[PDB]
């Protein structure tokens, strides 16, 4: 056979990300003495649309701690933030939407976004539009906290991981039908070359395990094992179950 489409993506060539018009990475500011032991005051200057991303971005301008210059950071905007708002970052910051506090400063039940995982990774969790995490518990004899992620999983993270209060703005985006091949086309033009998709059953045997046959059908179980070689692992990888979700397994 020949190298199948799933295998061709790892080489990069035409499958790299489409990032000419993007506005830079979105993250917190490098954690320093100011944010560990108090609070640093920032002003939101613009709310901007970032191509390839549903969450809007907030340009926050801080004043440098020890140099005579500005420091211009870029956050994933929480719903509610507006231009001219003073956001506050640090350990002693108030519990307000748009503020960045460590999780030891957040009561259980709080809603949080852009949560760090390692102290200083500048944000890994709950970053898509309308997504948040919830603080479940604190364990003060470890310096760790349990949060619920958007997927529902419960992760133990340090008590110094920083998070932004509230939820990421732009929520509700995926509830709108697209109605058109054209609308899907413009969505992916600014993300990556993954659209449209030809069904493997419509291919020839030389380029896909599902290809070929006098009728379009798979002919073998579509669930493939976890340890299958690349070029063989197509379909439902390491699936624990198939079929329509009902009852407990839908929970």
């Amino acid at each position: 056979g020949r190298v199948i489409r799933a295998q061709r993506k790892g080489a990069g060539s035409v499958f790299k990300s489409h990032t000419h018009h993007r506005k830079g990475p979105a993250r917190f500011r490098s954690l320093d003495f100011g944010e560990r032991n108090g609070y640093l005051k920032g002003v939101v200057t613009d709310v901007i649309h970032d191509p390839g991303r549903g969450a809007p971005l907030a340009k926050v301008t801080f004043r440098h701690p020890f140099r005579y210059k500005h420091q211009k950071e870029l956050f994933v905007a929480a719903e509610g933030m507006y231009t001219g708002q003073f956001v506050y970052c640090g350990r002693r910051a108030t519990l307000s939407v748009g503020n960045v506090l460590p999780l030891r400063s957040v009561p259980e039940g709080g809603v949080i976004c852009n949560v760090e995982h390692h102290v200083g990774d500048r944000g890994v969790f709950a970053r898509a539009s309308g997504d948040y995490a919830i603080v479940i518990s604190h364990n003060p004899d470890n310096g760790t906290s349990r949060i619920k992620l958007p997927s529902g999983a419960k992760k133990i993270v340090p008590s110094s991981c920083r998070a932004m209060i509230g939820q990421v703005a732009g929520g509700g985006r995926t509830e709108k039908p697209m109605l058109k091949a054209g609308n899907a086309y413009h969505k992916y033009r600014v993300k990556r070359n993954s659209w449209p998709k030809v069904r493997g059953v419509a291919m020839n045997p030389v380029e896909h395990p599902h290809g070929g046959g006098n009728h379009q059908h798979i002919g073998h179980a579509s669930t493939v094992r976890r340890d299958a070689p690349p070029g063989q692992k197509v379909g439902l990888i390491a699936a624990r179950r198939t079929g329509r979700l009902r009852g407990q397994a839908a929970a």
Binding site: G34, G38, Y39, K41, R67
Partner: protein, 229 residues
Amino acid sequence: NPLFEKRPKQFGIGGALPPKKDLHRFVKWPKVVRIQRQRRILKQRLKVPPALHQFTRTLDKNLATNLFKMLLKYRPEDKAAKKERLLKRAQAEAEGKTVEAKKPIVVKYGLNHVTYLIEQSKAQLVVIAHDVDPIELVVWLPALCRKMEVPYCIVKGKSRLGSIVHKKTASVLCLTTVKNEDKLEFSKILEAIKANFNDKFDEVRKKWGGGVMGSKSQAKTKARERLIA
């Protein structure tokens, strides 16, 4: 006078820009500096076996000034201090037809030479530098001098031994014979050296150095064990 006034700066965690204090602790150095500093630190942490921790116990400053006073007396003949006498003995040979210069007495150096003098028992005091690298050149000298029953000392600084003999580094010295004017001063020096070094040898061979953890680790160690108490 009434114009001169004071504008104290609120050098807080959100206030005025701080001044130029010393951040010598946090400077990110070149690799050559970086690796050498970690080299001493890693040495600290690991358990040094006795043969290598038999160093780390050097001769005192008080005794070294005493010993190095003697060695400075017996410096070998300088490069310049060596060509006029060969010039002078030309006439003694060319006319007098005799060489008459008598045995000049000085320290002996060079590792192979000193090892030779030790095993023939012509050595009376061995002086081993603590900082020879690679260390294997001298690790076994304490055992050989102890077995052959010659007093030996471990002074601090191979660069200093080399200075005596007019080299850059020397790594070992030994005095074979002193003049009849210094028997007393020589004897008193080597009495302590045998006591300091050749007496503890059979209990320092079973002493393991190293294992010292870091400052912040020890400050954490004490807190943990105090709560036990």
